[PDB]
Structures are given as structure tokens and as C-alpha cells.
Design brief:
Two copies of one chain form a homodimer.
Chain A lengths: L6
The complex binds zinc ion (2 copies).
Chain lengths: 6, 6
Amino acid sequence: NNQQNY
Amino acid sequence: NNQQNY
Ligand SMILES: [Zn+2]
Ligand SMILES: [Zn+2]
């Protein structure tokens, strides 16, 4: 799983 | 932000 918070 | 992968 991937979560990216820019 | 929230991501939960059960
Ligand atoms: Zn930011
Ligand atoms: Zn699972």
C-alpha cells in the first residue's frame, strides 16, 4: 500500500 | 489524511 502526503 | 489497509 501507498500513501503520499505532499 | 488516513489510509487503513486491513
Ligand atoms: Zn504539504
Ligand atoms: Zn488484510
